[PDB]
From a paper:
The HIV-1 envelope (Env) glycoprotein trimer, a trimer of gp120-gp41 heterodimers, is the infectious machinery that targets host cell receptors CD4 and CCR5/CXCR4 to mediate fusion between the viral and host membranes. As the only viral protein on the surface of HIV-1 virions, Env trimer is the sole target of neutralizing antibodies that prevent infection of host cells. The V1V2 epitope on HIV Env is targeted by bNAbs that make quaternary interactions that prevent opening of Env trimer to expose the V3 loop and coreceptor binding site, hence blocking conformational changes leading to fusion of the viral and host cell membranes. A new V1V2 bNAb, BG1, was isolated along with bNAbs targeting non-overlapping sites on Env from an HIV-1 controller who developed elite levels of HIV-1 neutralizing activity.
The BG1 CDRH3 length, 22 residues, is shorter than CDRH3 loops in other V1V2 bNAbs, but longer than typical human antibody CDRH3s for which the most common length is 14 residues. A 2.0 Å crystal structure of unbound BG1 Fab revealed that, in contrast to the protruding CDRH3s in other V1V2 bNAbs, the BG1 CDRH3 does not extend notably beyond the antigen-binding site surface. The relatively compact CDRH3 of BG1 results from folding into an irregular structure whose conformation is stabilized by Tyr100CCDRH3 interactions with protein backbone atoms in CDRH1 and CDRH3 and by water-mediated H-bonds involving other residues. None of the four tyrosines within the BG1 CDRH3 (Tyr100ACDRH3, Tyr100CCDRH3, Tyr100JCDRH3 and Tyr100LCDRH3) or within other CDRs show electron density for a sulfate group. The CDRH2 loop of BG1 is two residues longer than CDRH2s of other V1V2 bNAbs, and it extends further from the antigen-binding site than the CDRH2 loops of other V1V2 bNAbs. The combined effects of the relatively compact CDRH3 and protruding CDRH2 result in the BG1 antigen-binding site being more flat than the combining sites of other V1V1 bNAbs. The BG1 CDRH2 includes a solvent-exposed tryptophan at position 52B (lysine in the VH3-49*04 germline sequence from which BG1 is derived). Protein-protein interfaces often include surface-exposed hydrophobic residues, suggesting that the long CDRH2, and this residue in particular, could be involved in the binding interface of BG1 with Env. Unlike the PG9 Fab, in which the CDRH3 loop is ordered only when bound to the V1V2 scaffold, the CDRH3 of BG1 was ordered in both the unbound and bound states. The final model (Rwork = 18.9%, Rfree = 21.2%) omits the following disordered residues: Ser146HC-Gly154HC, Gly210HC-Thr211HC, Lys234HC-Thr239HC, and Cys214LC, and has 96.7%, 3.3% and 0% of residues in the favored, allowed and disallowed regions, respectively, of the Ramachandran plot.
Residue numbers in the entry:
A (entry chain L): 1 to 213
B (entry chain H): 1 to 52, 52A, 52B, 52C, 53 to 82, 82A, 82B, 82C, ...
The structure:
Amino acid sequence: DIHMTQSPVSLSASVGDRVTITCRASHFIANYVNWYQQKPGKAPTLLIFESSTLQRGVPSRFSAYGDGTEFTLSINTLQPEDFASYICQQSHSPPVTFGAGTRVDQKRTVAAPSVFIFPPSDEQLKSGTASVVCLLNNFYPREAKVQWKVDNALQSGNSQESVTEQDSKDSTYSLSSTLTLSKADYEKHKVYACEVTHQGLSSPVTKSFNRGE
Amino acid sequence: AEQLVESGGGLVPPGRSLRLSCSASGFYFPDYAMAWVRQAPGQGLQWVGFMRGWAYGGSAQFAAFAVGKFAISRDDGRNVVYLDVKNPTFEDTGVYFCAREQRNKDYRYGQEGFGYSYGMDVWGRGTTVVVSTASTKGPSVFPLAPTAALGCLVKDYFPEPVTVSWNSGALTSGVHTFPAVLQSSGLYSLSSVVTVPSSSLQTYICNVNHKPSNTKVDKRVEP
């Protein structure tokens, strides 16, 4: 199969910026590339086909070009409704294959998150499960590292993340991380910690609680 | 104008054959080759396969993983394309889009090579498929006990959506209700939070409503 490699993974830009997104094909595919836009919860929208033909009804600030191996999507100039993900696709031969996407969001100043930790309620444990929740509030950029620690033992594979869409008025993100443990496991240990690493923090921030107190 | 609409299920049992339907309107469907493209939670687009119109032989091709495990057929008089999944597993969870391949300037697909190079110009809204043994149900609401922050954990529900407000709408400043995330059980879970001055600990009540199960819950969040 032909593999499509999109860079960068993530891009921060301002209204009025000229934005350039790149897709690389593992094989020479001449002009057989399409570009799509996708916004959260929606189907993709075709922007470009045959690497540079603008799709009817798509605004002319979108253009694209390629050389058979490297293909470039250009937004000139970026508009508010253009903060979205962009996806390349080769149409050269089956199986059809897509790039992994490039996220374009709105640039703002670096903002560190406010971190909070929540123990599981007393009612949930009665049902046999314990959810521990870590909240990262109002930060930028979106990249954040959350490490769960239980009695100072690093956790892997038992948490789930959720990130808001970029806030409309202040361009920050908020993020939730939820650690799930059986009740029995939750009561064999004492100290529950959430450690947050972020560009805005001079060093990692840790919030924690001891069970029962 | 031109429109596709997928149907065929939220929670579906593993191992039982699954049929999705894509109904077309607003265009002459039998002229068009039709594709199925799926998107697992948090993942990128994955082409499942496509089928040509009758005038190009009506053959179908699939991604390597999908060969022999999925099937596509069309009923042109009913303006519908189908995707059949034999033996679905958790790996088949995601949103399934139906899409048509655009024809070129000359109302044609390409004459040389593959020929489907004018982009997928019409897409359905997508149908969420979750392969699991779980059943439809409303959510359990648990408090997230307390500048300070508190919230509500809205856990184990299907399908989307739920709506969450705070103090019946009177509290909006600092509220963040997070996108639902799918758990390994096949049920959704979500948290709603708000930051608040630690002196005010004012009363705090989250009001979660889940219409598909006729569930309304108001939970008091105290320290």
